């Protein structure tokens, strides 16, 4: 939702890390017409993590949106911005003709053309020298055989989908050393007590009767274990409340049988548990 957008030949490079990536704002800002992902499914972005996320923003035409993909050929996908074949990420683009256009012709957006060599993936060339196209070059002044490499976009109102300005944002995901620290939100739920609920406080998978505890911990301690290395107490990461992890219920049921030689009526015995935690006499 930024106001000033970078050109396609000088696309923006913002390192995003050490934060929670709430991707709902992406779906809330625009109808995401050109939303297409290549490494992760368009819905599992909140269920995994990455080390660093790079957001590349630029403005192109509506037909040039198809050039933002791993392996392409075109004016932008050869000389302006190229994605590697191993691109694992999403491509977001939407119409922006309402702000990036003017009646006299918007000239702040240009695209490079006629480069002598294809740019490597994720490359940015800031130089803007003349394009020498002859063994009798100019004396530095642009003209014959020294044509300008940057051509201005034809951004104007009343244009069609083929030429209207479209703002594109490329979210590249990276994995390397220094393990992942920027993940999506996990949507924590409300706390349930006095029930045999499964708990996952900061990854502590288990099951037990979460009851209020009086064993005050230290400010820097989050879990608690007994002699048997079994976790029996955990703090809710939302507050300073401490809960004891007691074993919910387990015990061998013994069936009292007087013997089929006499009768068929039998009884059961739930060893080590109350009668209030089991499904006449």
């Amino acid at each position: 939702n930024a106001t000033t957008f970078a050109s396609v030949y000088a696309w923006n490079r913002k390192r995003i890390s050490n934060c929670v990536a709430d991707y709902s704002v992406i779906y809330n800002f625009a109808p995401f017409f050109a939303f297409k992902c290549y490494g992760v499914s368009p819905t599992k972005l909140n269920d995994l993590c990455f080390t660093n996320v790079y957001a590349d923003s630029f403005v192109i035409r509506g037909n040039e949106v198809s050039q933002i993909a791993p392996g392409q050929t075109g004016n932008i996908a050869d000389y302006n911005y190229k994605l590697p074949d191993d691109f694992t990420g999403c491509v977001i683009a939407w119409n922006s003709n309402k702000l990036d256009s003017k009646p006299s012709g918007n000239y702040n957006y240009l695209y490079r053309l006629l480069r002598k060599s294809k740019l490597k993936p994720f490359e940015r060339d800031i130089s803007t020298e003349i394009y020498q196209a002859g063994n009798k070059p100019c004396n530095g002044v642009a003209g014959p055989n020294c044509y300008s490499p940057l051509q201005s976009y034809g951004f104007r109102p009343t244009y069609g989908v083929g030429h209207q300005p479209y703002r594109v944002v490329v979210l590249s995901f990276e994995l390397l050393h220094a393990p992942a620290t920027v993940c999506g939100p996990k949507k924590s739920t409300n706390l349930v007590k006095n029930k045999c609920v499964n708990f996952n406080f900061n990854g502590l998978t288990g099951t037990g009767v979460l009851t209020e505890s009086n064993k005050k911990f230290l400010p820097f301690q989050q879990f608690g274990r007994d002699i048997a290395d079994t976790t029996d107490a955990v703090r809710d990461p939302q507050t300073l409340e401490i809960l004891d992890i007691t074993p919910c219920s387990f015990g061998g049921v013994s069936v009292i049988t007087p013997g089929t030689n006499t009768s068929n009526q039998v009884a059961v015995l739930y060893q080590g548990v109350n009668c209030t935690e089991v499904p006449s006499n």
């Epitope: 017409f33 939407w94 003709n97 309402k98 256009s101 006299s104 109102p157 244009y159 069609g160 989908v161």
Partner: antibody
Framework: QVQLQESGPGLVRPSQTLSLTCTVS??????????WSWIRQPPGQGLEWIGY???????YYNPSLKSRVAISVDMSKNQFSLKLSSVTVADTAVYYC???????????????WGQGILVTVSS | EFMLTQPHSVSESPEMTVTISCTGS????????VQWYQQRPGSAPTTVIY?????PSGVPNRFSGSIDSSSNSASLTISGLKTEDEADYYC??????????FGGGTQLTVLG
């Protein structure tokens, strides 16, 4: 072929607001290379243009009818609704929904048109 | 600032040639796709001109566009007027600031 379904009342009280709807039948409203516009036909006058709306919703409204006319597309039900306030004897005209081509060239060639709802206003 | 002007009605003898101009007295006209439409009483208007120099496929080939008088005043040249050509016409253009401007009512009739 593709047709344009219309719905909405044609009799309202003056100094009020009216919202008319129009649904594209036989196709899909989310198809590209086309806009979606509403068109007014004043009685005794010529043809009047209200505004067109892309699938992104750039809100190209009429300058003389600013803050008085508004249309919003809703691709979830393949329909778009026109709304306006202060309806009175000033216009009491008929409105038509239609689509227009933007396939490379400039916006032109209205190929599909609506039926039209006579918006009569009386106190 | 783009404005148009349309005459009330134009009529001539059958098989003659008439000229109806949109009169772009304000703003540039040649920089946009000039359009002409056709409407019958009751029904919605239909397209009779799709391009500045090309006609749509759904209309008989009897229309020709006069885009400019070398300064201004775009026009439409219709050759071979007959009884089926009697209908209403409307100029359609756009401003450079995305302001669409319809010319207005233009009724063509034949003096039978």
């Amino acid at each position: 072929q593709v047709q344009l379904q219309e719905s909405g009342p044609g009799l309202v009280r003056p100094s009020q607001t009216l919202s008319l709807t129009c649904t594209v039948s036989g196709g899909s409203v989310r198809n590209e290379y086309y806009y979606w516009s509403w068109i007014r036909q004043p009685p005794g006058q010529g043809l009047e243009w209200i505004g067109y709306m892309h699938n992104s919703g750039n809100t190209y409204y009429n300058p003389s009818l600013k803050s008085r006319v508004a249309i919003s597309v809703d691709m979830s039900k393949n329909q778009f609704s026109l709304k306006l306030s202060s309806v009175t004897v000033a216009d009491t005209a008929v409105y038509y929904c239609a689509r227009v081509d933007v396939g490379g060239t400039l916006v032109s060639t209205f190929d599909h048109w609506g039926q039209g709802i006579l918006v009569t206003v009386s106190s | 600032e783009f404005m148009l002007t349309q005459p009330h009605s134009v009529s001539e003898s059958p098989e003659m040639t008439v000229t109806i101009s949109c009169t772009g007295s304000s703003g540039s006209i040649a920089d946009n796709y000039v359009q002409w439409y056709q409407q019958r009483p009751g029904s919605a208007p239909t397209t009779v001109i799709y391009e500045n120099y090309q006609r749509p496929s759904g209309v008989p080939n009897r229309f020709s566009g006069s885009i400019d008088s070398s300064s201004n005043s775009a026009s439409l040249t219709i050759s071979g007027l007959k009884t089926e050509d009697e209908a209403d016409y409307y100029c359609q253009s756009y401003d450079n600031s995305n302001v669409a401007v319809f010319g207005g009512g233009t009724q063509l009739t034949v003096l039978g």
